[PDB]
Ligand binder design. Structure first.
Ligand SMILES: Nc1ncnc2c1ncn2[C@@H]1O[C@H](COP(=O)(O)OP(=O)(O)OC[C@H]2O[C@@H](O[C@@H]3[C@H](O)[C@@H](COP(=O)(O)OP(=O)(O)OP(=O)(O)O)O[C@H]3n3cnc4c(N)ncnc43)[C@H](O)[C@@H]2O)[C@@H](O)[C@H]1O
Lengths: 569, 473, 397
């Protein structure tokens, strides 16, 4: 109850509700004191795992950005990928006809600690329901809305690497728990291809439903999972990236990745792993048989252990509990589960890569916490800008004329900042920084303060040397990705409950017929009015006599200047 | 590490390429053998030594055209072969890779123990290139290759009694193949069956000793840190370029260009600053950009040999700003024909790499902009000017000339002034050439006396004192 | 104004400020010349004179600008630059105007194209007199017997200049200053005159082209320091320092420099045409400091550095050409400081594991490279400093 946070009473009640929900093919609501449990009904059919309308080799559909805003990478922009049938069942049970939303609202009104339980196919819907409840009510106020838990038994994989990254960034991975046994085909059935098991699905699915082909089915599943297990560690280590690129397009792998806390179970021990990558390697090695006699009865035992989840509840306290990631001496606890020796080093490397990532984060924060780094920003914001404002010009045109000597200092302590910022960006892009680092408010504030002070000088340097004539406009191509990353991060941080390119527009509208740039001029005049008050652009520099914006507003026709909102001069 | 190679070998053996390749090769076996087998997933053909390749040159060209037409459909094609068929297929794919674009599907050749003799000179061009990624050699543990001058190229999949591991280092492949070649060739079908049985097995031992993996691992960190140290040196190279920019800006104040100033202080060293500009802020940039060009040409940073735009965008400015300083040193020694014989390689490489992507851009120009800080688009411009001077003096010093050499030198002067007016009309040259003590005005003064009765619109533009308005608002 | 500010300063500081007016007006002088002049003339220490220079810079009397990232070391003040304003120089020269030419200690002599000053004919008892020659000067002046001269400053402007004869009349001259401020390397001759003066201690030569072996032919024992700046190339018993800076035609160092046993600091700075060093440099006995800064064409260092027993301070610097270090440095026990800034192409030999008690000053990458042997070496005080990209080199443009 330390590395997970769940007691035995909640597990017992959730298991009882999941067992009782096997009837009527509907969700069962059970209220006890403060806890309100919702047990989703399982579905055992060939269409429940793979959607008939989907024509891809794997059940895949990109999440709609309107429904799930937080399930995306704020840097790249790639949305997550989930199963289609589970999502369809989710919006089917979420419709007002099923009255699930009313029950959820009634439970969130007075009760607290809402937990979601379900069986094999019920856990797949319970995970998505917990995600929906987190994105609807929890994201508004973490203190008002109690932390919703989720306990599933043998549910298959539902999200991909993007889903796990989005869960880890918002620190929501501590609310999901999935119980998996040593021999269970359901948690590992989604990694197999739809065409590989197209014939064997209905028979084994009807057999696993309560109330010769199995061997080939299990062999195909394990063979399809072995490729993913090997490619995962090959991409994590980076060995033979060119060979991986050559062999990647030849075959199609399932992008499903385990998400949330997993609790492996057996006769005597209860191992819990919190690493997203380690579980993928552990599943294949735990499903393996040591000798041929165990492999002979491997399918008959795997199809039988899928229902033997009631013993886990009664014998929870008697079993040994240990954490793999936090505690050391993983040799004994990994050998007791059944993993061989060669998988132990794979698991240890998958665990040590996270420690190396944390060490890289510590190095980055120690580098940015120095005084030499902040000295450049201090000199820029306290020495150069005020002394340039003292004259009859701004720090934008003074950097373009480059008459005095301080402009060389601005160039050097702008390139020196751009170098380290691009280094940090390349570190965070190549999967070398933790998922929470981008969610840190300190890094967001630092990136915003760096952008709002360096991007004007960057545009001045870009336009003062006529580089736009050879590299096209600055806004289209020629803008560093660090500014876009910082802008998207700041927007997602302020909108979870740009003005920096303002000059980049003024340089484009200058020297153009007024009849052609009507909409652009008026849109800029409408936007900078709020860009002044929110803090993106400054009111003093743009309104000086020597500023380029004043000359651009003067050269505009008097008809537009009379009705212009920014009439200050 | 060793387990990473074992995981790669397990992936490629469970993928099912080797079984189908061996089966198809032996079925074609059951000179030069050409296969036109087409599959729904990917095309797999078996080509089963210089004379044999040269004899089928027409068939090789036809097959290369067919393979290009097939790869145009975004379909991967793999060429395999027997012992000699492996070398034949390797030569064929090495010849075809030059025409095949890296953006399209790259052809992958898979050979089962083909002994080929290729000297280290051929291995040096593809030391870290992506060509090693095309060829995959799988050999038995007992079978080896006896090579003294030959160097192994490409990834080598070495199989053992249990499993197979891939080696991506040439030194490790040479160390493993240090023994003499084995005349006996075992059946690869039994080897594939044993590899499949080992992949089905839960445990697999590590056959590579620590001395083999040690050198590979320690070379890994240096070959991976060279990239990032160049990435971080780009920033102080930018500062050196800023130093040179400020030097040029200060030199502009005096009525003389920076090219002529460099040329005159190279012969009369003084003032203690041009020495630092020449020896400190110039050699660093040259060495760094030469290394960057060599590394990008060897191994691409992205597809289709596309280096990062941050690198090439700055390399273009570097070339356009530094090449005249090298032209000065080249022509001061007395050498001629710089644009053809004396031009460096990395300059032309950067020019081609910028011209490739210079079409997709949406650039547009307006005449009202100030061109004072504009850089000359043709960096070899000065390389022509000096040449014309070598002609002009040649007309005055040597008396008793044959009139035909006079005529061809007059034609050279005419084409030179035509090119000058062409690049002036398009506004593609810097206005620092019209300075008082600039070399262009000296050339014009030397050419005005020789021109005489002949007249052109360039002469009128120069005499009317309209060159002052050029490049200004 | 000027007189009250001069009187408010220290007496020694005021005398040094008054003597600083010997240089030409609106000129750019390096601090080493003034430092050596004040050390040999007044006799005070070099550190306290550097402190006096800093104090005069604090009072805005003179302008001191550094041109090198290296800090103020012991005996190395060549990178720094000291310029004076025209008004301050005129105010300093205006003092002691009532005193006669021979009565005043500091004198200024201005020469014409062919005419000579009236004071050059008669004898002058001044200890400090400077002669300024234009380009048209043919070294024709009246003879003067002035044995009291202890400091002589020459401002050359001719391509072919002849040394005056009355230098042989001088008896207790201590420093010689020859600075060619023309447009071409000046040619000099008639060196035997300086061979007659037996009390010359420090000789400085700027922008004068003379043959190298004519200096040992002088056979002067009193000489202690020799400097050569921007010069296109048992006799020396007490010569201790040889400064060769900014020589562009220096392909190889001459052989006579190696034969002397009394050198202790051999500085080779900004010599970008020298790629090889002779082995005879290892025959030197007591070389304390061996500077090779900014000589970015020096390929590798000779083996004879192993023979350097008392090489305490080895001021290596941004030498890009350096690619190899000697195989045995550990035999140099007295070595204390090594700077490897911007020069990482050379690989640290195994001998670095042997020598201990080193204060290494390098950059980030060189510091990280040296940190590989940090657990092996004992108490290696690796220090990483900062580089300040300044634009002060645009004054000597
Ligand atoms: N004509 C001149 N006349 C006189 N002096 C000159 C001249 N020219 C240079 N100097 C001097 O050279 C010094 C530096 O040279 P200099 O030439 O190196 O000049 P600077 O680089 O310091 O400044 C250039 C400005 O251009 C923007 O930078 C982006 C961005 O940084 C990167 C992608 O960014 P990223 O997205 O992070 O890269 P990736 O992640 O790899 O993208 P991916 O490949 O898709 O993955 O491209 C860069 N970029 C875009 N366009 C250009 C371009 N036309 N030229 C060079 N870089 C470009 C940014 O506004 C910067 O002010 C300057 O200080 C000058 O003193």
């Amino acid at each position: 109850e330390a590395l997970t946070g769940i007691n035995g009473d909640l597990i017992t009640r959730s298991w009882s509700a999941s067992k009782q929900a096997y009837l009527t093919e509907r969700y069962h609501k059970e209220e006890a004191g403060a806890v309100v449990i919702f047990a989703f009904q399982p579905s055992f059919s060939e269409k429940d795992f793979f959607d008939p309308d989907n024509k891809s080799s794997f059940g895949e559909i990109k999440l709609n950005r309107v429904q799930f805003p937080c399930m995306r990478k704020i840097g790249k922009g790639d949305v997550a990928t989930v199963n289609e049938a589970f999502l369809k069942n989710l919006e089917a049970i979420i419709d007002p006809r099923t009255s699930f939303q009313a029950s959820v609202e009634m439970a969130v009104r007075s009760r607290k600690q809402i937990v979601f339980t379900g069986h094999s196919s019920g856990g797949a819907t319970a995970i998505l329901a917990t995600v929906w409840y987190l994105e609807k009510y929890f994201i508004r106020n973490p203190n008002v809305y109690l932390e919703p838990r989720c306990v599933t038994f043998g549910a298959p994989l539902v999200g991909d690497s993007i889903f796990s990254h989005a869960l880890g960034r918002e620190k929501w991975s501590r609310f999901f728990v999935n119980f998996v046994s040593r021999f269970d085909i359901v948690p590992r059935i989604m990694l197999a291809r739809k065409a590989s098991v197209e014939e064997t699905l209905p028979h084994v699915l009807a057999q696993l439903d309560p109330r010769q082909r199995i061997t080939e089915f299990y062999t195909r599943v394990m063979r399809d999972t072995s490729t993913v297990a090997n490619q995962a560690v090959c991409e994590l280590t980076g060995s033979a990236e060119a060979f991986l690129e050559t062999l990647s397009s030849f075959l199609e792998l399932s992008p499903y990745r385990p998400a949330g806390t997993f609790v492996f179970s057996t006769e005597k021990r209860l191992v819990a792993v919190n690493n997203s990558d380690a579980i993928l390697q552990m599943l294949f090695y735990t499903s393996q048989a040591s000798d041929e006699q165990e492999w002979s009865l491997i399918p008959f035992r795997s199809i039988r252990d899928h229902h033997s989840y009631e013993e886990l509840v009664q014998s929870m306290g008697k079993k040994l509990f240990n954490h793999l990631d936090g505690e050391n001496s993983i040799e004994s606890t990994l050998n007791d589960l059944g993993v061989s020796t060669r998988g132990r080093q794979y698991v240890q490397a998958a665990l040590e890569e996270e420690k190396k990532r944390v060490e890289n984060q510590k190095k980055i924060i120690q580098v940015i916490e120095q005084e030499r780094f902040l000295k450049k920003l201090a000199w820029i914001e306290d020495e150069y800008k005020p002394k340039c404002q003292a004259h009859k010009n701004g720090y934008y045109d003074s950097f373009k004329v480059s008459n005095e000597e301080n402009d060389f200092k601005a160039n050097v302590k702008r390139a020196e900042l751009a170098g380290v910022f691009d280094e940090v960006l390349g570190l965070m892009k190549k999967c070398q920084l933790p998922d929470e680092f981008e969610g840190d408010i300190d890094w967001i504030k630092l990136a915003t303060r760096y952008r709002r002070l360096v991007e004007p000088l960057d545009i001045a340097n870009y336009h003062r040397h006529l580089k736009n004539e050879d590299t096209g406009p600055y806004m289209k191509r020629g803008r560093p990705t660090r500014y876009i990353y910082a802008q998207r991060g700041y927007e997602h941080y302020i909108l979870k409950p740009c003005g920096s390119c303002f000059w980049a527009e003024v340089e484009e509208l200058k020297g153009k017929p007024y009849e052609e740039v009507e909409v652009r001029v008026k849109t800029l005049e409408g936007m900078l009015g709020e860009w002044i008050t929110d803090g993106e652009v400054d009111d003093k520099e743009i309104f000086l006599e020597g500023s380029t914006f004043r000359k651009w507003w003067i050269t505009l026709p008097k008809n537009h200047k009379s009705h212009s909102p920014l009439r200050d001069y | 590490s060793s387990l990473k190679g074992s995981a790669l070998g397990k992936l490629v053996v469970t993928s099912g390429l080797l079984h189908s390749s061996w089966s198809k090769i032996l079925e074609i076996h059951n000179g030069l053998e050409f296969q036109i087998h087409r599959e729904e997933k990917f095309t797999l053909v078996v080509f089963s030594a210089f004379n044999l390749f040269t004899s089928a040159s027409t068939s090789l060209t036809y097959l290369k055209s067919e393979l290009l037409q097939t790869l145009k459909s975004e379909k991967p094609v793999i060429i395999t072969g027997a012992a000699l068929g492996g070398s034949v297929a390797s030569l064929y794919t090495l010849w075809l890779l030059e025409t095949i674009e890296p953006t399209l599907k790259r052809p992958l050749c898979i050979t089962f123990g083909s002994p080929l003799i290729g000297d280290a000179s051929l291995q040096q061009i593809l030391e870290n290139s992506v060509r090693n990624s095309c060829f995959l050699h799988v050999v038995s543990a007992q079978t080896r290759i006896k090579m003294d001058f030959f160097k192994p190229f490409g990834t080598f999949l070495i199989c053992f009694d249990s499993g197979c591991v891939c080696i991506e280092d040439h030194v490790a492949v040479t160390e493993l193949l240090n023994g003499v070649h084995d005349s006996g060739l075992v059946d690869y079908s039994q080897v594939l069956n044993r590899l499949d049985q080992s992949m089905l097995s839960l445990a697999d031992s590590r056959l590579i000793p620590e001395d083999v993996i040690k050198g590979i691992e320690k070379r890994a960190e240096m070959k991976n840190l060279r990239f990032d140290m160049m990435f971080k040196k780009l920033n102080d190279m930018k500062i050196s370029m800023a130093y040179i920019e400020w030097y040029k800006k200060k030199c502009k104040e005096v009525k003389i260009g920076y090219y002529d100033r460099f040329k005159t202080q190279l012969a009369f060293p003084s003032k203690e600053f041009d020495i630092n500009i020449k020896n400190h802020h110039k050699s660093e940039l040259n060495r760094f950009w030469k290394s960057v060009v060599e590394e990008v040409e060897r191994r691409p940073q992205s597809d289709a040999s596309i280096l990062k735009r941050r690198f090439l965008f700055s390399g273009n400015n570097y070339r356009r700003m530094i090449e005249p300083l090298d032209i000065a040193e080249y022509y001061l020694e007395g050498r001629k024909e710089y644009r053809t014989t004396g031009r460096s390689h990395h300059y032309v490489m950067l020019e081609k790499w910028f011209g490739m992507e210079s079409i997709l851009i949406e650039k547009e120009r307006c005449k009202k902009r100030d061109l004072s800080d504009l850089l000359t688009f043709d960096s070899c411009f000065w390389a022509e000017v000096e040449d014309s001077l070598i002609v002009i003096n040649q007309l005055n010093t040597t008396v008793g000339m044959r009139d035909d050499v006079r005529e061809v030198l007059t034609r050279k002067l005419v084409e030179f002034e035509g090119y000058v007016w062409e690049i002036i009309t398009k506004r593609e040259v810097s206005p620092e050439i019209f300075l008082e003590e600039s070399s262009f005005m000296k050339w014009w003064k030397e050419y005005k006396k020789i021109k005489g009765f002949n007249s052109s619109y360039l002469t009128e533009f120069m005499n009317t004192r309209k060159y002052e308005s050029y490049g200004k608002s | 104004c000027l007189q009250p500010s001069f009187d408010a300063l220290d007496p020694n500081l005021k005398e040094c400020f008054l003597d600083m007016g010997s240089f030409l007006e609106d000129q750019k002088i390096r601090a080493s010349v003034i430092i050596d002049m004040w050390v040999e003339l007044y006799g005070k220490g070099s550190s306290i004179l550097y402190m006096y220079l800093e104090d005069l810079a604090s009072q805005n009397l003179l302008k001191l600008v550094p041109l090198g990232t290296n800090e103020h070391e012991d005996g190395f003040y060549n990178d720094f630059l000291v310029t004076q304003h025209d008004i301050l120089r005129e105010l300093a020269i205006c003092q002691s105007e009532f005193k006669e030419n021979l009565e005043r200690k500091r004198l200024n002599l201005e020469i014409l194209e062919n005419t000579f000053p009236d004071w050059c004919l008669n004898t002058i008892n001044a200890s400090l007199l400077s002669i300024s020659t234009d380009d048209l000067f043919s070294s024709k002046w009246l003879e003067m017997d002035c044995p009291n001269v202890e400091a002589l400053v020459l401002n050359l402007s001719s391509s072919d200049y002849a040394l005056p004869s009355f230098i042989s009349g001088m008896k207790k001259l201590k420093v010689l200053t020859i600075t060619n401020h023309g447009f071409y390397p000046a040619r000099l001759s008639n060196f035997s005159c300086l061979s007659s003066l037996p009390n010359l201690k420090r000789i400085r030569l700027e922008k004068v082209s003379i043959t190298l072996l004519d200096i040992p032919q002088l056979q002067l024992s009193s000489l202690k320091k020799l400097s050569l700046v921007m010069c296109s190339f048992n006799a020396l018993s007490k010569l201790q320092e040889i400064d060769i800076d900014y020589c562009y035609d220096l392909d190889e160092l001459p052989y006579w420099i190696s034969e002397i046993v009394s050198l202790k600091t051999l500085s080779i700075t900004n010599c970008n045409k020298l790629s090889q060093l002779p082995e005879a440099i290892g025959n030197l006995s007591r070389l304390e400091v061996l500077r090779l800064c900014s000589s970015m064409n020096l390929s590798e260092l000779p083996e004879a550095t192993e023979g350097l027993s008392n090489l305490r301070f080895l001021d290596i610097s941004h030498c890009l050409g350096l690619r190899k270090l000697p195989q045995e440095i550990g035999k140099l026990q007295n070595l204390k400081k090594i700077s490897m800034r911007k020069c990482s192409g050379c690989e640290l030999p195994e001998s670095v594991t042997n020598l201990e008690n080193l204060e290494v000053k390098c950059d980030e990458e060189t510091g990280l490279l040296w940190e590989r042997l940090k657990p092996k070496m004992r108490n290696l005080r690796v220090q990483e400093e900062e580089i300040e990209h300044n634009l002060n080199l645009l004054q000597m443009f």
